[PDB]
């Protein structure tokens, strides 16, 4: 396999380079425009406010930027992200390895505790997932059996029926854990269907960019809602674990 | 299993709620720090610049925030969708790290990211298992010789296996944890605490995105900026084994 790993490694590099070219192509024009918009705003501010040097307005933007970066809101001049609800949810984002990061640890104690909380938490959750996975597989296969038997009742071949069940499994899962949530979130978060799918997939892949987070909205008086979703994550991850492993095996087959 | 899963589930829920209490305790005190900092800046600025109304400084901060939201950067390269940074971003997808220190702005970008990640994470997963075993066998070949020195002091060989495997995940730890923490301490101007936090947040694939090496070549050692993806890939393999060993131990107990 040593030759094939160099081949596989090179393929992954190409995959990244092809991803890189596509992402730049799609994203960089808007990034350049934001930069131009920031510049247009400074030049207009200087023109309006003679008592402000280019370089002084430079510091303002830098210092504003740092504070926004640490989660300050432009809209207000006030003065909970760590209410028992969100704090639980934050702990959830760790052990799941999703790690949205939409709220950051500011204390050295917070970070040090997070190092150990994760090192113990992630594998602990890994065990629960395997558990929920095995239970879920057994549960749906037993359930699929009854309607699987109805196809067998109309005299269809056994080797055909396993694959039909396998395909049927994928459809059931998607409805329950992909499309339903996208429709759920579409309504609850006021996102587009594509924003919602993007969130769902980014979540169940455990990537957790944190650009989109269900419940996070400061306005909503829905703390019970946020953990409710975390039960979707628990159930969802196991479904997507299967999907990811199976498409990996598909890639093995193509290889 | 029936008892096991519901017991284990309850244990995890307890763990989460106890985690929650700890975090809130340490982090709720400082919730408003960034809002306080923005305020200190606005007032300090009005005091310094009498020709600016509080309301005029107000619009500026919103208009700046929307620019930064578009991915503008305070300038005083630096493109996060230049080929280097974009490579690294794609990297953050397949690794499932997903820092999000730079987010996708376009609907097309997100849509592609879906199929990319969907066909990319497993592809990487395959190679990782690959590079895990390959390095595993290569280090194991190294392990056997180290086992020989322990064997020629008449230490029972099963202890040598554990002792060597203990040494395995310690030499790897020094190589992949300590080196980067020292490197990052120097290179990123972080504390060794901030560096270990970054390293472990990275290698656990949590990838908060509060701390990022950046893989953006700047000056003096640009080579090393993208290379750290090397450390990540190699590290994730070592950490993969570390994660399983800890998990296996928890299963055992």
């Amino acid at each position, epitope marked *: 396999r040593s030759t094939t790993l160099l081949a596989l490694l090179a393929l992954v590099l190409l995959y990244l380079v092809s991803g890189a070219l596509v992402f730049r192509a799609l994203e960089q024009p808007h990034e350049q425009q934001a930069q131009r918009e920031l510049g247009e705003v400074r030049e207009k501010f200087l023109r309006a406010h003679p008592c*402000v*040097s280019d370089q002084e307005l430079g510091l303002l933007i830098k210092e504003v930027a740092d504070a926004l970066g640490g989660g300050a809101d432009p809209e207000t001049q006030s003065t909970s992200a760590w209410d028992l609800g969100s704090a639980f949810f934050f702990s959830g984002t760790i052990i799941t390895t999703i790690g949205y990061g939409n709220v950051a640890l500011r204390t050295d104690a917070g970070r040090l505790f997070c190092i150990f909380y994760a090192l113990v938490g992630i594998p602990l959750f890994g065990i629960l997932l395997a558990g929920v996975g095995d239970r879920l597989g057994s549960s749906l296969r037993h359930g699929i059996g009854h309607i699987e038997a109805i196809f067998l009742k109309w005299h269809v071949p056994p080797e055909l029926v396993r694959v039909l069940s396998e395909m049927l499994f994928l459809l059931i899962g998607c409805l329950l854990f992909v499309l339903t949530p996208t429709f759920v979130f579409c309504y609850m978060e006021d996102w587009s269907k594509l924003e919602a799918i993007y969130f769902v997939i980014v979540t169940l892949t455990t990537v957790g960019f944190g650009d989109y987070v269900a419940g996070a909205d400061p306005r909503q008086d829905s703390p019970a809602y946020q953990p409710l979703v975390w039960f979707w994550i628990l159930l969802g991850l196991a479904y997507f674990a299967s999907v990811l492993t199976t498409i990996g095996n598909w890639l093995r087959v193509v290889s | 299993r029936s008892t096991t899963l519901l017991a284990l589930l309850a244990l995890v829920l307890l763990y989460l709620v106890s985690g929650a209490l700890v975090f809130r305790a340490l982090e709720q005190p400082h919730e408003q720090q960034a809002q306080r900092e923005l305020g200190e800046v606005r007032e300090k600025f009005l005091r310094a*610049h009498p020709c600016v109304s509080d309301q005029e400084l107000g619009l500026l901060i919103k208009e700046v925030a929307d620019a930064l939201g578009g991915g503008a950067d305070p300038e005083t390269s630096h493109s996060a969708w230049d080929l280097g940074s974009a490579f690294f971003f794609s990297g953050t997808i397949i690794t499932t790290i997903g820092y999000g220190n730079v987010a996708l702005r376009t609907d097309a970008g997100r849509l592609f990211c879906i199929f990319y990640a969907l066909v990319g994470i497993p592809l990487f997963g395959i190679l990782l298992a690959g590079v895990g075993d390959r390095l595993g066998s290569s280090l194991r070949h190294g392990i056997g010789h180290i086992e020989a020195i322990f064997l020629k002091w008449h230490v029972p060989p099963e202890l040598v296996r554990v002792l060597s495997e203990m040494l395995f995940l310690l030499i790897g730890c020094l190589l992949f944890v300590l080196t980067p923490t020292f490197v990052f301490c120097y290179m990123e101007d972080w504390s060794k605490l901030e560096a270990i936090y970054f390293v472990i947040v990275t290698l656990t694939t949590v990838g908060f995105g509060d701390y990022v090496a950046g893989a953006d070549p700047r000056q003096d050692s640009p080579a090393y900026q993208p290379l750290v993806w090397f450390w990540i890939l190699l590290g994730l393999a070592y950490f993969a084994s570390v994660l399983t060993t800890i998990g296996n131990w928890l299963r055992v107990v």
Partner: antibody
Amino acid sequence: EVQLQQSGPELVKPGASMKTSCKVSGYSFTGYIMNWVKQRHGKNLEWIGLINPNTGYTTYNQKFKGKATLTVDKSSSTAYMELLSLTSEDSAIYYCTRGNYVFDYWGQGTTLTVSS
Amino acid sequence: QIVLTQSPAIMSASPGEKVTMTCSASSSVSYMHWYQQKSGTSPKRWIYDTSKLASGVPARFSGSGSGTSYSLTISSMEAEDAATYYCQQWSNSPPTFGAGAKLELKR
């Protein structure tokens, strides 16, 4: 009418330092940024640096970092530029000029001669 | 660090000639300003923000352009228009000028 009146022409020995002066009038000194520009016979007009007379905030052209010290007297609404360790390369006309994007008002200029 | 290029460095116009001097930016600039300077006197803000005339600049003078190319234009050259014209820029610290365009009178 805005007016920048600089101090008169200065002759100093090589190595010596020199301070010139720009008294503004017809507006408020502290309201607008003060810059200094160098003009020799053989080069482009060169921005030396600026001061915010209200804050005392200064930035310099990298080329002049060590050479020039900008200061104001708010009470006498006078801007000062100091040039250090003078070489014949510093023999030029120096202007003070007002502006944060365009230099809208200029002094009459002052001619520095570095000579033994 | 942006470089502005005025070429030719020197030019001549018979009275009534339309004159156009150009200023090239090394990288893209939002606005260009211009200064007129007659020997012995300081430079006077002539055009600012690319196409705006200063207090008493006669209307026969126009500015124009965008990106990395800007132009000062005289509809009809007059005697008193003979002077050095400099383009400056502050879309980027530090501000910079052209080496200048001396406009002589043809006779």
